[PDB]
Assembly symmetry: C3
Homo-oligomer: 209 residues x 3
């Protein structure tokens, strides 16, 4: 995927992701597909400006519970980190990613960011786009208009949204109990955030079981 | 171990650890067993209020030596992290664990905390309690009253206290040089902190060699 | 390598690295050998006092680009971390390493520090010195005076400088695409920092390809 990585001399370098053959715009995806990723990675994605300082602070200080605590990276931060060439993880690189995230949010709307996200992160088996992965893993499609191809299910969406946390380890064919827990949590959060309903939720929990 | 994990709506969720079949109270353990864990994880456990700010600061700024520097998590922090469902490690989750640790210290005494610790952390091979591990690995017991079962040795205590830092990697049967170094350091610290004496120390160093 | 590790009661403990059989002083190495490590780990090594606060801050805030951002550890910090016994990585240990780095910079000149670096970090296959590794991996030597032995090439220097980031994983014989990317970047930085020229750069890129 080196061609679709760089140093970010200008944020318009991300536009080159649009020329991938399996590129699919966020606009062209079903909501529950997008919400699988949003719910699992950065629930207030549409609301914040790349950092989610307010919501992070509430989830921390408002309840004793960890119910609202999320992972350490908003989707916008993840897009920066994945556009930058692969490198060792450190505080100094994280901070640069935060700085650049602000520049990405300044230039692009949430759907463009989300499109750069889903079409340039690693899903396993050499797939750096969400359509390549769905096709490869399930032979399904995340284009909501297709009349040609089976549409990605709720479960399969959750599976891919959880998978990108450890794409080389989490194995779709032989799912570990931990990968299974991750996906279960993803589904529940898709339900709580109203991307799916009880029926879908139960159908997906059944399929997973 | 999912049943004995949760979101901590209330700190009294930890009391459910008490119903594990192999539950053994800290009160019912030999001191050198407890000190194996305390010495290796959080020496001033009994003295601090969950954070060890004072002692951490001295170990840092008082001597050039690293002799008094410890790991990044007090036993109380470890109990929170292990009660929370398995999740990716991040700054935002660490901070929530610190917040909740303060609530745990407010409610419980040190022996209750230590009991929640030793009976709900992972020791390897599907063992989430210190008695299950001792029984499984050594066929020994950490109940100081048993007249029925061989009592866990000093070495075996150090081995398990070091093991929980990387329970899936550190292998009791075929010990790596690093695991071996960890255990050696544990024994020395058990000696320096007066949980064991020279005799015990040397007997354990002999057995390890 | 335990003998050449310790608690740093005094910074003069590092002088014992000088008695290693394959010890080679930085003074006795070709510049491009040293620059392979400097360029890849800490470009302003000679200029800063162990922390590189100024340059780190510029690389962060001056350009949107990540072009000048480096890894999270100056060579002096790396020498401390590697002199200290192997231990779990944490914020509290990192901070102690920073404190001691300042004491190392106070006592020693840059060539002594660089000599402690290259002669006590892990290169793979049981090699804790740069000469042991060059001899073992390539049968070459980093002593610039040798009339006896083939001299380490530009490529081989970059390979070893990148290798110490993950010495047990990066494999010289069967190089992963990532290890390959690391080395490529190292060479380019050796060129940009004027340790090598275009000819050398291209010869090394050819050999690597
Ligand atoms: C104090 C103040 C003030 C402020 C504080 C502040 C600043 C906010 C916080 C600062 C603290 C920050 C610190 C300390 C550090 C910053 O960094 C930390 C950590 O950064 P990351 O490690 O990048 O983040 C990972 O962990 C996060 C976390 N713990 O919070 C996370 C869960 O939030 C991230 O999740 C998401 N979604 O962002 C998680 O990111 C994921 O991390 C995975 C890596 O996991 C980790 O790295 C492994 C390296 O391989 C380590 O070994 C693990 O120990 C580690 O946890 C990324 O996966 C990797 O993706 C690569 C592209 C894969 O490599 C490819 O593999 C390919 C392959 O064929 N693989 C295959 C196989 O081999 C088998 C099947 C295959 O497909 C090829 O070999 C190819 O050549 C190769 O390039 C590679 O194989 C694959 N690795 C794994 C384990 O799956 C994966 O691609 C990446 N996903 C995305 C979307 O970015 C941070 O930013 O939080
Ligand atoms: C700036 C200001 C201001 C403030 C700064 C501030 C806030 C203070 C600091 C913030 C910075 C914090 C940051 C950046 C991050 C926060 O997080 C960091 C890091 O957190 P952790 O990674 O959780 O902490 C580990 O590292 C610490 C450290 N480096 O300082 C440590 C040494 O202090 C911790 O030690 C203790 N005792 O707390 C250490 O915790 C241990 O970490 C082990 C994991 O190591 C790490 O995670 C691995 C994940 O597997 C990674 O791959 C490693 O790269 C990584 O170092 C825990 O072990 C895991 O335990 C799990 C339960 C195991 O999984 C089970 O395995 C089972 C199994 O069968 N396994 C088996 C096999 O496969 C083979 C035999 C088996 O038994 C099953 O598969 C089962 O399904 C599965 O669930 C799993 O397999 C097992 N992993 C390993 C390697 O042994 C293990 O259970 C856990 N132990 C306890 C008691 O909690 C932090 O809090 O410091
Ligand atoms: C908020 C404010 C204010 C301030 C913020 C502040 C303070 C600045 C930041 C604080 C945040 C800090 C935090 C959160 C944490 C601090 O710590 C972090 C992380 O520390 P490290 O993990 O030590 O640093 C590594 O990562 C850095 C990074 N991400 O930024 C890095 C890239 O900058 C470092 O690179 C250099 N050059 O410093 C990198 O260090 C390297 O890290 C390697 C380890 O990688 C990591 O640790 C692995 C443990 O094995 C983990 O599994 C990985 O997940 C992890 O990334 C060191 O390598 C190890 O070297 C050991 C010596 C090897 O073990 C030996 O192996 C031998 C062997 O035979 N191996 C062989 C095989 O098995 C096969 C062939 C073999 O040779 C034997 O078994 C022997 O017994 C055994 O002892 C061991 O096998 C080998 N491991 C690997 C993967 O190669 C390796 O030796 C070490 N190199 C040097 C020169 O020190 C930090 O300081 O930044």
């Amino acid at each position: 995927n080196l061609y679709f990585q760089g140093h970010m001399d200008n944020v318009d370098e991300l536009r080159k992701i649009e020329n991938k053959s399996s590129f699919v715009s966020a606009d062209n995806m079903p909501e529950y597909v997008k919400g699988a990723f949003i719910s699992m990675q950065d629930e207030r994605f549409y609301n914040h400006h790349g950092f989610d300082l307010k919501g992070t602070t509430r989830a921390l200080f408002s309840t004793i519970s960890d119910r609202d605590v999320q992972g350490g990276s908003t989707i916008t931060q993840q897009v920066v980190k994945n556009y930058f060439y692969d490198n060792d993880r450190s505080f100094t690189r994280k901070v640069k990613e935060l700085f650049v995230a602000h520049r990405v949010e300044k230039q692009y709307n949430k759907n463009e960011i989300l499109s750069f996200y889903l079409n340039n992160i690693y899903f396993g088996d050499n797939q750096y786009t969400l359509e390549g992965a769905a096709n490869h893993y399930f032979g399904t499609t995340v284009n909501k208009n297709s009349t040609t191809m089976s549409h990605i299910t709720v479960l399969q969406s959750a599976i891919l949204a959880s998978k990108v946390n450890a794409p080389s380890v989490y194995n779709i064919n032989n799912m570990s109990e931990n990968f299974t827990q991750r996906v279960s949590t993803n589904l529940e959060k898709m339900k709580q955030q109203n991307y799916i309903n009880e029926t879908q939720y139960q159908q997906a929990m059944s399929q997973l079981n």
